[PDB]
């Protein structure tokens, strides 16, 4: 017997399968109310303040 | 222009019985050797895709760091799913003796999809090349930790054939 | 559960006696069917989300009144609970193939379904419309083996007879 | 509604007569279905009595080393007599007066 | 067991004295407002099929972990047992409101129910909420203050009865706690 | 009530997952060794009456105080019960070997068996002696090492069932402790 | 209490016989792969806090009705004690692995756990889901099989230990189920 | 619950005594303070959804680095959890105004919140930056009285000096 | 302090018995790591002066917002303090891997650590980026043998399972 078969095949890694993007519609949906994150503004990184000496002022 | 199993959404099984295998085994030259080379891969299909994508991490540990692609355990499992599907069509391509279904259904557009999702192509070229170097040793039975029980003879013709299929995968995402 | 092992060990226990020679011929018949039944459980375990998607909306195509205000498919989230309600019954058919008997159906899916579906006003005729579609949309060599499709269809008629 | 009616279960406690019955049948009918939760909440608080006596010994053994506070022995075999005196008196304190029974209970439910 | 008439009888028997004409005035208003109490038990028991239905389905939508697998309302056998666990409780409240006393549920329903749910592993935080939902549906039915259904009554106010069934649905939730 | 096939669907019901091909291969190996199990159950139930006769009469001969006046097997009344206290155990053990799971005797034999013996004063050194003896006999019959009872089977290995039935008897001994 | 080296002694005291070649070579096979054993308990203690931080987050993500009020992980004090309940049961498994025998966790950890979880209103099936992930987290670390993190050892096989802790995590699970 | 009524009866219970009139002075202080404390809670019950959205926008404005991967704001489902984590605080701040004491806060939200935030790598520096934006831009004559703007704002910085 | 010797010498006194022959078997196991662990102590003691830089620079790559004004690394002198900070933790792994236990760490490094970090607002998740970088750096062929790679890498994993 040779017995090929074409079927949808996936794997997992310790808590979750691979096809969890396109879940069936009854499996997910309407669990909680949804927030929206605001725009976090990205500023530059600074320098220092040495002097261990202005820090009490 | 893909292959003779053109059938889409009707049953999907298509086994071959015993006497029709005798019409097939007396129709392929080294058809006994070709069936043992497929069965030396598909018995070891779980360990092949596990050692490949861990050895990809063992040479490139930047994909487990946040920002890397194989963070967020679904995406590691999606890389394990894509490692299986690259193996299962090449294990079909050794069986059929052609890369026509492989180049049309599996490798077609694989360069454009992986750059669409931000998949690193150079790491996946390393992932197929580990899967190339394993299946050479499985077919010629120079696999270290596990040796199969085959009949006597050589299989260096089929081992050069299966490296040609794995170089087509490395060409299609280069 | 009800299977071949639980049945002969119960009638042994309900008669105070060791496992006899007739208690081992029965489990011999579990060996002659497991290789023709576990591949029906194999096919259903990897193809469930496509067979529940098309069997779920075969009832909404049949009974289109359910998407009315005041009905069982009022909003979208009660439609999604129905797909969850149907993906349980395909999961228990999968468990009856693995155990061998019809224990997982008439102890987790059938027992108490009359009191629940009368109380919450859920029509059982739309359940058996979603299960009779799966039993008919099935080819014997294409979807399964020749005798795996006899096992899988023998449990899809246990649901339809139990919900009627 | 579930069925044609909703009668109470025969597994519910205090369901039989207990009016002019014998002593054997009186006690069988007052403790009908109450024996389970009496033994559930008997191993419950005994595990609580075993659990907080562990959580305070962690201070007695800080980071996996024993202090000078444990010291159950000083001479050869100086814990064997301490083994008996701690467990024989624990039975002596379980045959106390019936006035000291709830005096132990209501005062433990005062200071804690 | 003991209704409101035989409640004052056993209280007068501690004194072993005749029930006079100075203590039946609390009973004669209970007769004179008796036609309101028959008018209100009929308010509850005419739509008890939806009071128990709406309570359990409301208990589930706040705590959805009761139907996630292994849950206490997971299979159809657990759920259909809950929908009779929840209406036997309403069966004795409607008994207690008619008799005008709490002697029919504190001795036939709740005497022995606290140890039963901890035997079966039933959570109490869910079983409280299904009772307190049915409480708020009853005072919306004792007074004609419901949203979807209204009934036909005479003019008046029954806040003495609506405060009484609130005093019967909370001795449930405190006994099972 | 729960065999080896239903422990897999009990385990896979907590995940709410279909039984995949990963777990069916351990369950296909149960079927593939299915004839060795029926060749092993028959090797115990066919000489079961001699096993419990050997274990009780072997226990009393290494402890002759068990029949001395003040012992637990003094009269004929205490001896007829000892011969069936032991053969009730061995009957329920073979149910757990025939099924593949210990969920028959831990639900119908061993629960409450600890509290039963301490009220009677059945000694705990002797209850686990006779099931350490019947453990030695049961591993001597499934593998053909019985000295005067050579049943004929095929050639092969049965060390796997030599660990399965040998785990049950020291699970009874952990229960009557 | 007692390890495996003192388990073979207390099974032999009922035999009243010295220890010899009948029962020593399993302890010889303990020592001869003893370097494998404490090589395996290193790769549990080294990443134990990440295991339960993933196990309880994996528990809530499957059943999100545990953080809703009525679930037993609603309060922060309900969720802080969930870690330390789910850390001690992992800590007791690490004692059984090092000592070889599971005698330590069956009595100091599990005796009285089933009766307390149904006294405090702790959901049983939610904990059994959490300890099953810790079963899966262990065997992915004994054998270097986990995806995101691996470490370098001496080349060999360790399936005897990976099947041992799988027998150690369900005796926890059968004590709660 | 640590309310003023409980603290004066717990010391009354511990001394084995009756309710003395020294505690009755403290109950008189409630009904003077209760009117200037409940309308801080009544205005919070009608403004909670508009204040909890406006709070978390300064959480991500002061620290915009949380949108990086590996942090606590990389995907949408846990930014949704961030608004739920901070709504639960500003409900327990509403609950403690009605009681009058700090009872619900230090028992439900606070006790056990340290050893789970560093466990799941959540900083408290962004937690205290959410309510300090809420506690600042609120004009004491414009929204409520000059007394509720003192008493309610005395509850919000109770979190900050218990978390830092 | 914790070691092989001082742990097992305690139960001799705390149970009031002599030195046994089982504790004599325990120091024998310390001989098998005495020429197997101490090679890593002399390794890093001549190696810290270049890895205090590359593991001190390791965390600020992960967390560039510490050098931002306002937070705990707002000036240069704070970063002068910050490099001295991380030169106390693996200053103790030279003290821990010379003794045989976690003695210099469980009594000097973690005791009171979570309480001086909540009050002084030091993010504990940057120490997870500081010395666990050396865990992802360690080369068993080049730097030192796989006996340090199982023991120096173990003592680090003690610390990340302590500062989290
Ligand atoms: C809802 C959210 C959600 C999750 C958090 C995960 C949770 C999760 N992880 C694993 C499974 C696992 N979890 C871990 C744990 C870890 N991996 C590591 O290497 C670290 C040390 C540690 C995280 C810090 C490991 C090692 C496995 C096994 C390997 C794997 O499956 O990837 C499993 C087991 C599958 C089962 O249930 O049988 C689950 C549920 N899945 C989810 O759906
Ligand atoms: C090198 C180390 C070093 C420091 C870190 C500072 C610390 C510091 N700050 C102030 C100074 C002060 N500190 C406060 C108090 C505060 N204001 C607020 O709003 C906050 C909540 C809180 C600080 C967190 C006030 C009000 C003053 C006085 C006003 C001022 O000088 O700015 C003082 C008093 C000056 C003195 O000592 O005589 C000191 C020592 N000084 C040092 O030598
Ligand atoms: C788990 C169990 C399981 C099943 C029972 C089937 C059920 C099934 N069949 C088809 C799919 C199909 N089904 C048929 C049906 C038939 N062909 C014929 O010649 C007959 C007239 C008829 C059998 C009686 C055909 C022709 C297709 C291909 C697409 C279509 O026409 O629907 C599909 C859509 C996906 C696909 O194309 O595979 C599904 C879910 N599949 C499963 O996975
Ligand atoms: C490999 C490619 C392939 C084939 C060559 C055919 C197989 C095939 N078989 C037979 C020949 C036959 N076919 C049958 C038919 C049957 N035998 C039985 O025992 C059953 C009752 C029944 C259905 C299987 C019989 C009886 C013969 C004649 C004897 C024989 O040669 O087997 C013939 C005609 C004569 C011949 O050429 O041999 C062909 C063309 N099918 C294929 O797929
Ligand atoms: C952590 C770092 C890490 C790695 C870098 C890789 C190590 C690794 N091993 C192999 C190589 C191989 N891998 C296998 C696979 C297997 N052998 C079996 O017996 C099993 C059936 C199956 C899963 C274990 C085989 C058969 C070879 C070829 C034999 C060999 O070269 O050793 C290869 C491919 C050959 C090459 O091009 O170098 C690599 C990269 N694995 C790791 O873990
Ligand atoms: C049979 C059809 C089939 C293909 C032609 C290929 C192609 C392919 N890859 C992915 C999708 C993916 N593929 C990977 C895989 C990888 N990324 C890495 O970092 C590694 C190098 C590598 C694994 C070894 C990942 C991580 C995703 C998910 C990407 C994402 O979710 O953003 C998807 C899912 C997206 C979709 O359905 O639209 C598909 C179809 N895979 C298939 O299943
Ligand atoms: C393990 C076994 C198992 C099952 C078999 C189901 C059975 C089941 N279904 C529902 C619940 C439901 N079932 C349906 C299903 C349907 N309504 C329709 O329009 C159609 C007739 C049909 C699907 C096509 C709907 C809509 C609900 C929600 C009804 C409600 O509660 O208002 C409930 C109540 C609890 C809940 O809401 O989940 C239960 C026990 N659930 C289980 O746990
Ligand atoms: C006279 C008064 C009276 C009662 C109140 C019930 C009390 C009661 N309930 C159950 C039994 C039960 N009761 C419930 C009910 C619930 N569990 C939940 O999750 C919810 C909180 C709640 C309903 C919404 C459930 C789920 C069972 C389980 C049935 C089973 O174990 O199969 C049982 C045991 C089964 C039986 O004996 O039939 C009893 C005695 N019976 C009575 O005779
Ligand atoms: C998540 C799912 C979900 C629901 C299904 C509803 C269910 C629901 N309805 C009511 C509340 C009520 N439920 C009823 C019951 C009925 N009304 C009628 O007219 C009928 C006769 C009968 C059911 C058909 C009544 C009369 C009220 C009070 C009026 C009202 O507040 O709507 C309550 C009480 C609120 C509380 O706890 O205080 C709940 C939970 N709410 C939810 O959150
Ligand atoms: C056997 C069947 C049977 C019944 C159904 C009741 C029916 C009933 N209700 C009332 C009569 C009444 N019922 C009510 C009660 C109410 N009005 C409201 O608006 C509130 C919603 C509700 C409070 C519970 C009031 C206020 C009266 C007027 C008389 C009175 O107050 O005593 C009367 C006396 C006057 C009349 O005949 O009209 C009767 C017979 N009695 C019965 O014997
Ligand atoms: C002084 C009294 C005394 C006895 C009566 C015997 C009884 C006896 N036999 C065995 C040991 C055994 N007993 C049997 C039982 C039997 N063998 C057969 O062939 C029959 C079918 C069946 C008896 C009717 C078997 C099969 C073994 C193990 C192997 C063997 O000896 O044959 C043991 C276990 C030894 C132990 O404790 O570990 C004992 C106590 N021994 C004694 O010391
Ligand atoms: C209804 C009643 C019923 C039975 C009694 C058994 C009878 C039975 N046993 C075996 C078959 C067997 N039985 C054994 C068992 C053993 N051999 C040994 O050497 C060990 C001492 C002993 C272990 C217990 C083995 C090893 C085989 C052959 C299986 C194999 O070799 O793979 C077979 C298949 C091979 C054959 O005999 O043709 C059958 C039918 N089956 C049944 O259906
Ligand atoms: C000797 C061994 C030993 C144990 C096994 C545990 C057992 C245990 N758990 C808790 C107590 C608890 N344990 C949990 C934990 C959980 N609840 C859930 O829903 C989840 C399944 C799980 C988290 C994953 C919870 C929520 C409490 C309640 C704490 C409280 O009352 O506030 C308590 C004390 C009561 C209390 O904390 O108030 C004890 C002794 N402790 C020990 O010392
Ligand atoms: C009873 C009161 C009560 C609380 C106070 C919270 C406390 C809390 N928060 C989270 C869980 C969380 N809390 C946050 C919140 C934040 N992270 C950030 O980026 C910001 C600093 C902040 C939002 C402003 C996030 C992102 C998670 C998810 C972390 C995770 O699950 O891994 C969890 C884990 C369970 C869950 O995710 O639901 C708990 C118990 N929950 C409660 O039930």
């Amino acid at each position: 017997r040779v017995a090929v078969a074409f079927e949808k095949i996936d794997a997992a890694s310790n808590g979750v399968k691979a096809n969890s993007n396109n879940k069936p519609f009854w499996k997910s949906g309407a669990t909680t109310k949804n927030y929206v994150a605001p725009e976090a503004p990205a500023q530059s990184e600074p320098e220092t303040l040495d002097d261990a000496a202005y820090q009490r002022y | 222009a893909f292959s003779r199993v053109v059938v889409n959404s009707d049953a999907k099984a298509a086994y071959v019985g015993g006497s029709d295998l005798q019409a097939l085994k007396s129709f392929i030259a080294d058809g006994n050797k070709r069936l043992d080379a497929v069965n030396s891969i598909v018995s070891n299909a779980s360990c092949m895709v596990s050692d490949a994508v861990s050895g990809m991490i063992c040479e490139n540990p930047g994909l487990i760091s946040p920002g890397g692609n194989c963070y967020t355990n679904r995406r590691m499992a999606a890389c394990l799913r894509d490692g299986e599907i690259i193996l299962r069509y090449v294990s079909y391509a050794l069986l059929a003796g052609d890369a026509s279904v492989l180049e049309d259904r599996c490798l077609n557009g694989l360069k454009e999809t992986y750059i669409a999702l931000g998949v690193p192509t150079n790491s996946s070229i390393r992932a197929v090349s580990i899967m190339k170097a394993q299946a050479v040793a499985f077919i010629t039975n120079t696999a270290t930790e596990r040796k199969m029980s085959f009949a006597a003879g050589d299989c260096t013709s089929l081992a050069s054939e299966v490296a040609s299929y794995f170089d087509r995968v490395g060409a299609a995402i280069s | 559960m009800k299977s071949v092992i639980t049945t002969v060990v119960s009638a042994a226990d309900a008669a105070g006696r060791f496992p006899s020679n007739s208690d081992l011929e029965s489990i011999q018949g579990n060996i002659q069917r497991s290789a023709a039944r576990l591949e029906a459980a194999e096919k259903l375990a990897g193809n469930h989300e496509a067979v529940v998607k098309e069997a779920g909306d075969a009832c909404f195509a049949k009974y289109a009144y359910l998407k009315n205000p005041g009905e069982a498919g009022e909003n979208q989230e009660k439609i999604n609970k129905c797909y969850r309600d149907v993906d349980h019954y395909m999961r228990l058919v999968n468990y009856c193939l693995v155990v061998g008997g019809t224990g997982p159906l008439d102890e987790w899916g059938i027992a108490g379904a009359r009191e629940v579906y009368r109380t919450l006003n859920l029509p059982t005729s739309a359940y058996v419309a979603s299960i009779a579609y799966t039993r008919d949309r099935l080819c014997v060599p294409r979807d399964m083996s020749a005798q795996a499709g006899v096992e899988f269809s023998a449990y899809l008629d246990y649901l339809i007879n139990a919900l009627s | 509604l579930t069925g044609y009616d909703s009668k109470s279960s025969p597994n519910f406690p205090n369901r039989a007569a207990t009016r002019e019955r014998r002593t054997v049948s009186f006690n069988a009918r007052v403790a009908r279905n109450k024996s389970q939760a009496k033994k559930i909440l008997e191993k419950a608080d005994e595990f609580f009595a075993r659990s907080v006596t562990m959580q305070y010994k962690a201070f007695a053994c800080p980071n996996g080393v024993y202090d000078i506070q444990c010291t159950e022995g000083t001479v050869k075999g100086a814990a064997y007599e301490k083994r008996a005196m701690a467990v024989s008196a624990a039975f002596r304190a379980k045959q106390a007066s019936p006035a000291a029974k709830a005096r132990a209970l209501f005062e433990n439910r005062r200071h804690a």
Side-chain angles (χ1 to χ4, degrees), chain A residues 1-13 15-47 50-55 57, chain B, chain C residues 1-141 143-164, chain D:
Chain A
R1 195 190 196 88
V2 183
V4 193
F6 273 79
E7 61 54 40
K8 290 187 180 181
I9 147 157
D10 53 49
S13 65
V16 59
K17 282 180 171 53
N19 314 349
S20 23
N21 282 329
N22 2 315
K23 259 185 194 177
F25 55 92
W26 65 90
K27 202 67 67 68
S28 64
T31 308
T32 172
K33 111 176 182 51
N34 191 22
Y35 290 179
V36 136
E39 245 358 89
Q43 306 346 84
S44 86
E45 62 280 348
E47 189 262 294
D50 229 303
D51 268 304
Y54 38 75
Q55 286 91 321
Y57 309 109
Chain B
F2 63 97
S3 71
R4 316 303 165 162
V5 49
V6 79
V7 279
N8 296 144
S9 57
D10 41 358
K12 299 187 178 191
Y15 81 109
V16 167
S19 176
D20 301 338
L21 193 40
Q22 302 274 355
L24 195 88
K25 289 296 284 309
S26 88
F27 220 72
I28 324 177
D30 55 62
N32 264 302
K33 303 193 201 191
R34 193 174 287 271
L35 282 182
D36 267 334
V38 170
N39 205 16
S40 162
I41 296 174
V42 308
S43 314
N44 306 311
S46 66
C47 201
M48 270 161 93
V49 309
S50 279
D51 193 63
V53 316
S54 65
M56 182 186 50
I57 291 321
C58 201
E59 301 163 32
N60 205 338
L63 290 94
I64 312 293
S65 46
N69 233 88
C70 306
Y71 202 47
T72 76
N73 290 315
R74 190 257 163 199
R75 272 170 160 186
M76 170 55 82
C79 189
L80 279 169
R81 180 189 42 89
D82 273 30
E84 275 274 341
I85 286 163
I86 288 299
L87 193 57
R88 288 286 197 193
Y89 278 99
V90 175
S91 87
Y92 193 74
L94 177 59
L95 185 73
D98 53 61
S100 200
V101 54
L102 171 63
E103 280 275 348
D104 200 274
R105 302 312 300 181
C106 197
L107 299 196
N108 184 37
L110 200 46
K111 185 57 175 58
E112 285 94 21
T113 45
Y114 277 164
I115 67 172
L117 302 171
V119 165
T121 71
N122 47 359
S123 151
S124 60
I125 284 170
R126 194 60 199 107
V128 177
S129 182
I130 291 162
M131 269 193 288
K132 181 170 63 182
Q134 284 178 343
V136 172
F138 279 112
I139 279 172
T140 60
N141 223 333
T142 62
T144 44
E145 312 99 315
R146 175 164 191 265
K147 287 177 170 298
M148 292 285 310
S149 157
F150 291 136
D154 68 315
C155 287
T156 172
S157 158
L158 297 167
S160 45
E161 193 190 83
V162 68
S164 164
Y165 294 137
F166 276 124
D167 292 354
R168 281 157 170 271
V169 189
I173 56 179
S174 291
Chain C
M1 292 302 162
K2 190 194 187 80
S3 65
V4 73
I5 305 181
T6 68
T7 312
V8 297
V9 77
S10 297
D13 201 9
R17 58 181 299 165
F18 276 84
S20 302
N21 215 14
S22 53
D23 296 330
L24 319 168
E25 300 175 72
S26 63
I27 317 177
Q28 176 54 61
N30 212 21
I31 317 174
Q32 300 307 124
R33 277 276 189 271
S34 299
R37 158 170 62 76
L38 286 180
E39 76 262 32
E42 272 168 85
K43 182 78 209 96
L44 195 50
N47 208 34
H48 64 269
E49 72 274 15
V51 76
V52 78
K53 149 89 178 84
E54 66 153 11
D57 51 12
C59 87
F60 288 110
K62 177 160 179 38
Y63 307 107
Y65 74 96
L66 307 161
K67 308 221 184 185
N68 279 350
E71 287 303 312
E74 270 164 40
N75 39 355
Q76 177 55 51
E77 68 98 14
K78 280 177 75 172
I79 290 172
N80 298 21
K81 251 186 170 176
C82 170
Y83 282 165
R84 200 258 316 152
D85 277 354
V86 170
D87 209 6
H88 273 128
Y89 273 151
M90 302 320 288
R91 196 166 57 88
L92 296 180
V93 164
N94 176 226
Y95 292 159
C96 286
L97 303 158
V98 170
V99 177
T102 183
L105 280 178
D106 56 59
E107 207 270 331
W108 291 330
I110 302 298
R114 289 164 169 189
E115 273 94 335
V116 166
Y117 296 154
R118 160 176 57 251
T119 296
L120 317 176
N121 200 5
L122 301 166
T124 65
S125 67
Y127 270 90
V128 306
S130 156
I131 295 170
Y133 180 74
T134 306
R135 192 211 49 191
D136 287 16
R137 188 71 221 276
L138 163 72
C139 281
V140 180
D143 309 305
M144 266 172 211
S145 187
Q147 275 279 132
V150 192
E151 294 302 313
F152 166 76
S153 179
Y155 293 116
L156 290 199
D157 293 291
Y158 192 84
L159 286 173
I160 294 175
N161 290 145
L163 302 183
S164 287
Chain D
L1 308 184
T2 56
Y4 297 98
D5 55 270
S6 62
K7 293 179 180 57
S8 88
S9 175
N11 288 310
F12 210 86
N14 319 293
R15 274 302 163 274
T18 77
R19 184 58 90 178
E20 194 63 28
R21 310 304 214 275
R22 301 187 297 176
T23 308
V24 196
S25 163
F26 192 82
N27 308 143
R29 264 158 164 179
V30 293
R32 205 71 159 272
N33 307 113
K34 317 170 162 302
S35 58
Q36 214 53 55
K38 184 185 55 60
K39 92 175 57 69
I40 283 172
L41 294 160
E42 199 48 69
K43 285 212 60 51
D45 52 354
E46 186 202 39
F47 186 81
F48 289 139
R50 281 191 280 113
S51 180
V52 299
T53 180
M54 291 169 66
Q55 298 193 224
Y56 286 127
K57 299 296 194 295
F59 292 100
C61 192
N63 64 273
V65 64
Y66 299 89
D67 46 8
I68 202 167
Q69 206 193 358
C70 272
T71 53
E72 301 152 317
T74 170
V75 302
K76 297 190 289 182
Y80 285 119
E81 66 274 19
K82 294 280 295 182
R83 153 85 198 283
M85 293 185 285
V87 73
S88 72
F91 152 78
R92 184 148 67 249
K94 222 198 270 175
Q95 46 169 27
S97 179
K101 296 295 287 183
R103 187 143 83 255
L105 196 141
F106 281 69
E107 197 165 339
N108 272 318
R109 219 187 48 232
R110 210 163 50 84
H111 290 292

